[PDB]
Symmetry: C4
Subunit: 467 residues, 4 copies
């Protein structure tokens, strides 16, 4: 029983000296790291190409349909117009470029059927109801909705009477929004060199001329949603795509091995907890017989299993919404590579470092509460005071990120210089605030982490040497 406990608590390098104790339970993990990492790598390299094609097409559409687009968006919208004539020019430019698409596009593009199954362009208006521009406003608080369909045989009639229509009498003082929507077909023909059957895309596009604010500016949003659809009629010679089976079977293998690892870890947690029960019953050492790394391994395997299920679901139904699956697979890989530290601890001279890391969290995290109370106080004060006058302090989230950057010393001179001296009182308070915060956190609080970590090191070092 003493030998049993010694065996249960030792390492595999020492356990191997038993005449039948081969380390296959470790071999499974050594397989698992490689299999999971290669699954992640192949998934990422596949995902990247689809993302690149979709975003390249989005940029090309922005250049084609937005007048005067400079190639870079504003903070959340592609471009803006401040003049009543510029809005008309942009609105008509988008329609005229849609009309001429076949003669100006460099891609494999074509027209797609719309919601009415027509090939055509739909544009809609939203005006506050009940038509001077002030002093007597007779508005009535709800929205008129108007829409019109512009088809190719309309937008082409040599005399484009559609510009002269009564629809486009916009009355910008009532106007909330103008929306232009259309469908396009594309092909990622780049893939043809592999002799795989090229896949089509269907792009659903909307251009939003948005002025909910009524603050003298119209914001132009461009949004593009792509579906894979199905090659309608591509007579391109070559072969179809079936590699999908090689993805599905590999995901099945990954799921199987992760389940096997989870079974092994749960079994090990059971046997050892029983041994503790045996130890408790034996005679009138620590209560925690469970190896902590098994919890991490179990979590890793569960997340890998569910993430692989999501990936198989996405591929089977031919989706491109990779957010949640990417999160599960990435976090699982993170925990798997963290779990490798379990095997460095056996070799000595890493052990004191690992023990220092493990022993330092219970005090670093306790320091973070005392520091966080002050950090929250400065977050609220900075947001309320410097917010109207400083780009970094616009909202509590950005204030928190800015202060966290300042604690680590990043981008500090710009933080001082970015606030204008329009109000001397607020500027003086800004200097007081910034000097106080930076001094308090960099020269004292940040160094207390150094103090704590250094002193936690010496205890473990002196414990290890004293024994």
């Amino acid at each position: 029983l003493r030998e049993d406990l010694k065996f249960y608590f030792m390492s595999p390098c020492e356990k191997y000296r038993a005449r039948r104790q081969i380390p296959w339970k470790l071999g499974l993990q050594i397989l698992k790291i490689v299999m999971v990492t290669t699954q992640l790598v192949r998934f990422g390299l596949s995902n990247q190409l689809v993302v690149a094609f979709k975003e390249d097409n989005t940029v090309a559409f922005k250049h084609l349909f937005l007048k005067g687009y400079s190639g870079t968006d504003e903070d959340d919208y592609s471009c803006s117009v401040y003049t009543q004539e510029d809005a008309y020019e942009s609105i008509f430019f988008a329609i005229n470029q849609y009309h001429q698409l076949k003669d100006i596009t460099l891609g494999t593009l074509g027209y797609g059927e719309n919601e009415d199954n027509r090939i055509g362009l739909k544009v809609c208006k939203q005006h506050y109801k009940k038509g001077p521009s002030n002093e007597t406003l007779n508005i009535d608080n709800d929205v008129e909705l108007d829409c019109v369909q512009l088809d190719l045989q309309d937008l082409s009639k040599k005399p484009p009477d559609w510009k002269n229509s009564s629809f486009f009498r916009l009355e910008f003082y009532r106007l909330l929004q103008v929306e232009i929507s259309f469908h396009l077909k594309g092909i990622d023909l780049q893939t043809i060199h592999s002799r795989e059957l090229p896949d089509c895309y269907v792009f659903q596009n909307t251009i939003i001329f948005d002025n909910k604010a009524h603050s003298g500016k119209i914001k132009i949003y461009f949004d593009s949603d792509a579906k894979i659809e199905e090659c309608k009629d591509l007579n391109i010679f070559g072969s179809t795509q079936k590699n999908a089976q090689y993805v599905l079977v590999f995901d099945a293998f990954v799921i199987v091995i992760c389940l096997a690892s989870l079974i092994l870890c749960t079994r090990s947690i059971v046997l050892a907890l029983r041994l503790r029960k045996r130890f408790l019953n034996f005679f009138l050492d620590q209560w925690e017989f469970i190896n902590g790394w098994y919890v991490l391994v179990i979590i890793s395997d569960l997340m890998t299993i569910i993430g692989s299920i999501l990936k198989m679901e996405i591929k089977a139904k031919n989706l491109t919404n990779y957010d949640l699956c990417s999160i599960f697979l990435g976090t699982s890989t993170l925990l798997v590579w963290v779990g490798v530290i379990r095997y460095l601890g056996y070799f000595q001279a890493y052990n004191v470092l690992i023990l220092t890391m493990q022993a330092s969290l219970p005090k670093v995290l306790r320091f973070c509460a005392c520091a966080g109370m002050i950090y929250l106080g400065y977050t609220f004060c900075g947001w309320i005071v410097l917010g109207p006058y400083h780009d970094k302090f616009e909202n509590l989230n950005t204030v928190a990120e800015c202060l966290f950057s300042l604690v680590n010393g990043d981008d500090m001179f710009a933080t001082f210089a970015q606030i204008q001296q329009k109000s001397i009182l607020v500027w003086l308070f800004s200097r007081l605030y910034l000097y106080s915060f930076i001094s308090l956190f960099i020269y004292m609080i940040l160094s207390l982490f150094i103090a704590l970590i250094t002193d936690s090191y010496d205890t473990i070092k002196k414990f290890q040497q004293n024994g």
Copy 2:
């Protein structure tokens, strides 16, 4: 009496074990943090919308009335012109855009009455008195002031003779300033979806073509001052605004609870100081019976009270000048959230960290004097030497901010590279200066904070363990 002193000096977790000692005095504070923080949050979320509307309108006005405005100002002024014809073009552009406002604005704008109660545009000139452009200047040191009113029925006469008037013979060698001023009305109609009565604004605008320097450049300043006025005649259906009462009553509650907390803290300071008098009289422990946190709490509550008074004053009189009120409320919230640390000290394992923080100021602040003498010396030397040749060293304030950034390691390579090699002597001195300063402060002085903080940690740790 011994039990009394023990009770007076202990914690509420231990004090609760007395048969009648419920912690209501702490419950009041736990209410107060929440109430003050929610007051700050609601104030900020209200303030942000008004600021956003005013600044969006300012940007729209800059785009409308400034010729060739690029969307970003220069360092303190919107744009500048260097040519005699460009000044005329900008001056006439502003007037022509004002004339056509109804046909070019995307907002709810309209014309506002001016100082003479006319609807019109006022422009004024300031020329050095006493009319070649040099070698014989007959100037006489004081300013001619000329003004003219341009009304809509003047600026509209098909033949705009106002451009041909003798007023605009500017003689830029004598010219100090040309100022264009007008009033506009606006509505933040965005709010209408809440069925609150929309509020109007009145914008007072001035465009200043400023060349006091006479240095070959005219600086164009745009300034816009907004008042809330009063919806003149908006027949928009819906309801008026009364929520203001919900703000006033909530501020009243906040003031009441802050006064209650202040009363409790002052009472506690009195009773305890008397106990010290009793202790002094008792027999032939430390002189400081007063809990230091009460001073912070009293200051916090006083600032909250006066800030809430200012907020109620602003809302009652319908102002938008939030600077001082924001300062009081933000600093009060900062101190309130700092005061939470009082309650972490009871739980142990935060106590050594709090004691280290409290014990480290009396030596960090004493080090700051010895460091500050050197820092001041470098500030003066950098300002006098590198100031004409380096954008960061233009004035003592910016020199101080730059050096404080350099001590923390920020934006260092740009600091070296930003000075041109026009003069080799000054460049060599700049390298000597920057290497000396950065070495002295980063590798020695900055690390002395680490030394001080780490060693202050060990005293408290060894005091706590030794007892």
Copy 3:
């Protein structure tokens, strides 16, 4: 024998007191540092001029032949076009500028003979074979190659029928690439003031209008390859270039002295290893008699020898591909200047610092494994999750560089702000990821280096003082 071992293990300052022991073996090294450093300096100052001329000519060519070039490239290509007409305009612009080169260039340029020994311009197309723009694509997966030669007496015929040719019917839906290629001659006439014979260059230029992606954008690549050729017929009065002999003989001297130093070091390693054999045989001190600095010196000299051989080879055959030779010479110089620390250790008060540096690697490098496992986990997770949404996380290499920067605190606020809030799930994960990583590495792991280095210092300090 005891005196022998004492002599063998001491320093030259003490060894000099023997009646015949002059330090010539150190004099050779003191010569070697200077000779190698001056070789590097002269090589770099020569290389820089050729690189500057070639790159200045490349920039001038980009301005001449690329329509609307702004002076700065995009991330890997000079400029791009998104419209079917812009591609034609750029393609014809390049040819027209080539036709008019004699009248628009500011340099000493001239036309160079092409592959067919003609003076002329070659342009080629690559179209997917087998000619609507979709729904029925009859492509057949391999490439048509077409080329045509445009000579000066063609591109000049007053009626430039070459624009009307059937060649330029591009059919951009099939188009892979259009390539324009030509030769130019130049002279670095700047050198003439030295009365050295000026050298010619031959520039081989290719302009690639590349749209392999078919993603609605054509990428324009400009590449220029320069050869030295040979002054064809420059009647400029002066003298030819022969200094090359002064380079060759100096390289020969450097090789000779480096071989001598290597011989001395290998001889010293032999004698001392024998002494250890003698010490082993003497009686029933440490096994490592070899001085570690000799290994560094031998490596330095070998790399210097082979690098100088490569430099002589380059100069003899008149190449300009300096990559590998620069690597050998630079690394050799790095190791040579590192080897100087050998001589600071003799003077005391540097010895404890050198011993601390030497004693700290065996634990810093062991900590790097435990830290690297976590760092790899975060690299994979960041690449898979934030990659589609963040410019810094596009690929594993850039993720590794970004995380390594973040550990050192660089460019942190931009790292937070650069990811858009398009997807709330990914944004929340990004905040979790960034706060966790930055906290874990800056406040704990980075400070463990401080702990390790500080404690390694005290052991050596206390060992040195105790003896």
Copy 4:
């Protein structure tokens, strides 16, 4: 004698208790800091205005006379042209703008007499002598110099035959340089509001169209040299400037007090050195009786004296070349404010910090040699390898500044990303280089400063406590 030594070695706070020992020797210094600092402040505030006027005029001239100037220079030159027609357009634009100056300037400008005492414009050419554009160059290695004078009555003749002159047949293949030079008069009329007599300026301007490189680009340099001259005939009513006397007399007072302080310090060094001689003779304590602060004070006063002499010289002769005087005054002020630390040491609890600072240089500076050998090795290797491929590594000075920034952690991610992957070998070496350097200096060497400073702190702390 024992009391004498005690008096000589104590502090003024204790020395004051002698019945006649008033601290006037300290009062002189307390006066001196204020007087020197105010001299520096007044000098800087005066210098700044003249610099601002001169540079504002320079920017206005750049906008007036350079075609298409964008408002920001290139790295050392205002703008560049790459096409043979652009050079002609810029050259003629400068002359035409000079011709029309009276009608386009916004300043008080006027024409100034040239070297021939004419009012006129001089332009000069420099062509390699001995007139195809290659394959047969008949150049002869020295420079033709041609010049022509364009006067106002020439540049005005309605038919400006000067453009058609044979002078402007530039032959850009031989051309080295074209230079345009002219004189202007200006007035800083801004000062008139003080009723001081406004001062004139004379601007000497040169525009250099420089293509020494012959690398396909012409660089356009603009240089402007301003002299104060003397108001020629300004009939502006007011008063002349005499405050200059208030500057001269104040500088005289500063010189007098600095000489007095130097006399006192030298006298104190003499008396104390004699006392040491007395102490040596007294009987069979440390050799260094001299107070170290006196050396700093003497240096400060000498530099202040010579700097004030230079300032008086500059003002008397009406110069604007402030470089050397600014250096002396700034360094003197730096040392004066450093000398204040002498008086903080008396108050205790600063003494241990000052002693730690003084005791830490003899080991930080010794560590800097061992670190500097490695730093030099990396400087040479980086310059030779990454120099052709990285903007930060162009030359040894910039390499040194970049590496010094990297040691302090600044601008690191850009340092990785700024090198293109054109050559995979150099890119791989760049990653090896950057990771090795950053790891070695940040995680080990930089932390050794923390170790040294922290341990130097504890010795002084334990010495001070043990006594």
